[PDB]
């Protein structure tokens, strides 16, 4: 009876995932989250079965020669091409551009629903981490339907594909592990949906 966005740490889990995909690991936003996931205890509070997180607990604490910051820069910033670009219209748009037709559909939906959540200036709204942060934002605000529509229509149609390629191309134990946690967690959320995920063709 209680909506899944309002229980079992939905907003909490969506923020951790959202922040680690959007902010650099040394940042004020992400560093405390990096510390949490690289330490014992986080598995007890995360909304998945503890035994099924056990490999991730170990994975996150696997030591590596490449630093978290170097991995993050390589994967999310540049200067060279990103292995798995975290913007939705890269996956949903025929021409695979940023600020695509799917980005516009997201923008119009936000407008109609009077959602005042704004991204950084010059940034598209369809960043993977941004959308999770917005979803947590709506959940905190009790906006159940909007949270459900966000995920079903604007995130889940492309996020599984992005995560499949991202996990494959992470090449860093921490960020590979983050990808797998995101895939499991979002797949669990997808199964709790009361409206179906929008089926859209992928071009990447």
Curated annotation (Swiss-Prot):
Family statement: Belongs to the TorD/DmsD family. DmsD subfamily.
BP GO annotations: chaperone-mediated protein folding; protein maturation
Keywords: Cell inner membrane, Cell membrane, Chaperone, Cytoplasm, Membrane
Role, per record: Required for biogenesis/assembly of DMSO reductase, but not for the interaction of the DmsA signal peptide with the Tat system. May be part of a chaperone cascade complex that facilitates a folding-maturation pathway for the substrate protein.
This protein's record includes keyword Isomerase: no
Annotated GO CC locations: cytoplasm; plasma membrane
Topology versus the membrane: Peripheral membrane protein
GO terms assigned for molecular function: signal sequence binding
InterPro entries (UniProt xref): DmsD-type, DmsD_chaperone, DMSO/NO3_reduct_chaperone, TorD-like_sf, TorD/DmsD_chaperones
Designated name of the protein: Tat proofreading chaperone DmsD
Gene3D superfamilies: TorD-like (1.10.3480.10)
Subunit field text: Monomer and homodimer. Binds to the twin-arginine signal peptide of DmsA and TorA, although the latter binding is controversial. Interacts with the TatB and TatC subunits of the Tat translocase complex. Also interacts with other general chaperones, such as GroEL, and proteins involved in the molybdenum cofactor biosynthesis.
Organism of origin: Escherichia coli (strain K12)
Domain of life: Bacteria
Subcellular localization, as worded in the UniProt entry: Cell inner membrane; Cytoplasm
């Amino acid at each position: 009876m209680t909506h899944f966005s309002q229980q079992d740490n939905f907003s909490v889990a969506a923020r951790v995932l959202g922040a680690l995909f959007y902010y650099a690991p040394e940042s004020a936003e992400a560093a405390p989250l990096v510390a949490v996931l690289t330490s014992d205890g986080w598995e007890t509070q995360w909304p998945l079965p503890e035994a099924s997180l056990a490999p991730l607990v170990t994975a996150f604490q696997t030591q590596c020669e490449e630093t978290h910051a170097q991995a993050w820069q390589r994967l999310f910033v540049g200067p060279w091409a990103l292995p798995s670009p975290p913007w939705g219209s890269v996956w949903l748009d025929r021409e695979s551009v940023l600020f695509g037709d799917s980005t516009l559909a997201l923008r119009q939906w936000m407008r109609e629903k009077g959602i005042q959540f704004e991204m950084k200036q010059n940034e598209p709204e369809d960043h993977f981490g941004s959308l999770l942060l917005m979803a947590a934002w709506l959940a905190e605000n009790g906006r159940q339907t909007e949270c459900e529509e966000l995920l079903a229509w604007h995130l889940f149609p492309w996020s599984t594909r992005f995560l499949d390629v991202f996990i494959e191309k992470a090449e860093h134990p921490f960020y590979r592990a983050l990808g797998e946690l995101a895939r499991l967690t979002l797949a669990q959320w997808q199964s709790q949906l009361l409206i179906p995920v929008a089926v859209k063709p992928l071009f990447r």
